[PDB]
Amino acid sequence: GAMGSMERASLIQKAKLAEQAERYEDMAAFMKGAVEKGEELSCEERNLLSVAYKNVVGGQRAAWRVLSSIEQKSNEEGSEEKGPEVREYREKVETELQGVCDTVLGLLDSHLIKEAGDAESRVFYLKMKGDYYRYLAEVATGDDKKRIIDSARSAYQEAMDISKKEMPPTNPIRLGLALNFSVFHYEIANSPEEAISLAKTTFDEAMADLHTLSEDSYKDSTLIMQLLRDNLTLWT
Amino acid sequence: GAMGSMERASLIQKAKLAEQAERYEDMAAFMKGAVEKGEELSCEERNLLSVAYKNVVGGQRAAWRVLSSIEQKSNEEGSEEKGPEVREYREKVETELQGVCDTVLGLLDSHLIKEAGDAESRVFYLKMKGDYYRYLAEVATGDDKKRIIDSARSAYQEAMDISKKEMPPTNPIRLGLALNFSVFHYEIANSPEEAISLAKTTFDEAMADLHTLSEDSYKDSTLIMQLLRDNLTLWT
Amino acid sequence: FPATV
Amino acid sequence: FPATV
Ligand SMILES: *CC(=O)NCC1CCN(C(=O)C2(Nc3ccccc3)CCC2)CC1
Ligand SMILES: *CC(=O)NCC1CCN(C(=O)C2(Nc3ccccc3)CCC2)CC1
Ligand SMILES: [Mg+2]
Ligand SMILES: [Mg+2]
Numbered sequence A, B: 001g002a003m004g005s006m007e008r009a010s011l012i013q014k015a016k017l018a019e020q021a022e023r024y025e026d027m028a029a030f031m032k033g034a035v036e037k038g039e040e041l042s043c044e045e046r047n048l049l050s051v052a053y054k055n056v057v058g059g060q061r062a063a064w065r066v067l068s069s070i071e072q073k074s075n076e077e078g079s080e081e082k083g084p085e086v087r088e089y090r091e092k093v094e095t096e097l098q099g100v101c102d103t104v105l106g107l108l109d110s111h112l113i114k115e116a117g118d119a120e121s122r123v124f125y126l127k128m129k130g131d132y133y134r135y136l137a138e139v140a141t142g143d144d145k146k147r148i149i150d151s152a153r154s155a156y157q158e159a160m161d162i163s164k165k166e167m168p169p170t171n172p173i174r175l176g177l178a179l180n181f182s183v184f185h186y187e188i189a190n191s192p193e194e195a196i197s198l199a200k201t202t203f204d205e206a207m208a209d210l211h212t213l214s215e216d217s218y219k220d221s222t223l224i225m226q227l228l229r230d231n232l233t234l235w236t
Numbered sequence C, D: 001f002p003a004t005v
Helices: A008-020 A024-036 A043-074 A084-114 A119-139 A145-166 A172-186 A191-209 A215-235 B010-019 B022-034 B041-072 B083-113 B119-139 B145-166 B174-187 B192-206 B213-233
Strands: none
Touching: A008 A024, A008 A043, A008 B041, A008 B083, A024 A043, A024 A084, A043 A084, A043 A119, A043 B083, A043 B145, A084 A119, A084 B010, A084 B174, A119 A172, A145 A172, A145 B083, A172 A191, A172 A215, A172 B041, A191 A215, A215 B083, B010 B041, B022 B041, B041 B119, B041 B145, B083 B119, B119 B174, B145 B174, B174 B192, B174 B213
């Protein structure tokens, strides 16, 4: 693509600059370029990839929710007809969101996941796959909605299976995967009890392993544990 | 352009939706489309145009300043050479910024300013022209930097002349023009004393006219007066 | 909206 | 940065 002529190292350098400038669309385009060089990503590089796309899609999701709410209000009894514009613009934002998700899922399928053999990398990528199918699910209404939901579930489940076998219960990737899969259960799969059980069990297994950790690892793990607690508080 | 097939009213409707969704790039593209329909803009529509581009360019300016600071640090004694990437990326952001400014200046020249006969509209557009030449000046380093600075000055001065003849000293457009022209003096023209004098005289002339105003007009005028005071506080 | 990372 | 509108 447009980044094909730029050195891998320069792309990664620029991604870091873009992050400092809060230019997340640029960050994402640089990281896509870096992935397309065909070499595996380091841990630092995986973090850059994830941050970039999280921020881009996060902004799209927030906009889509604003628009969807306006659209919903327009279809209530007593709302005066304002024409097709709200639906059209929601559709526009939705199509852009779907495109970003398809781009991320594309990078994971070609060929990040298949080349990832270490547990941390494979879990990280499979968690990402779950996440971007979950964003597709949030906006899905068609014949494929159940398959999209099941694609997220399958990715998250594979990641969970690997994480439980290969990583300690305090590992931040394991914790983050569990946090997100729990949100999937609550928000997407209509399974709040599964969501709660997962968050609680994850929190408690992590708590029991904190004693093994350095101060720096403890900080990393407890940050995500607090997110689990925050969700549990919201849900109970 | 891409908006040529969309109704003017639909573009304006969508601009308002985009604003609610904090989608300022879309807002700006909708408003460009609306301007290109060739009809004069209402007051509400001028506000939409200005808000959209202010937010787009504001974000570009903030990014450019982050990058320029990194670039400056890299050229200090003792900084280890990191190659062309910081300059290239600053240049990339700079070129995008310049393009937005050229787009706004283009709308004003073809044909918003020439068709604006009422003082409020003509001052508003000439203030915008000053503003977008001022953003060009912020990043200018070439043979044309003095002409860019003088283009901003000329636009602001024409607007000032009209505003003083045709609008009361509390008029928000008059106040905003003075606020911005004062910043031009301080930041661009190396004329801090002119900047201070302008802000002070504007504030004091407005203060003396507040007695004429309704509560709603008083609120509008005093908001901008406080910005004048805030700058004066920064500068003295 | 619930927390995710 | 100073205020502008
Ligand atoms: C070795 C490796 O692949 N590391 C990735 C890195 C793990 C730590 N990390 C985080 O803790 C945060 N993001 C995140 C956590 C868990 C799963 C995915 C992402 C949480 C604040 C950053 C960054 C990524
Ligand atoms: C009739 C007309 O052209 N109105 C434009 C409208 C004036 C009020 N206004 C503002 O006060 C704010 N922005 C601004 C002020 C002065 C000059 C340019 C812009 C200040 C908060 C919004 C919006 C535009
Ligand atoms: Mg279980
Ligand atoms: Mg004077």
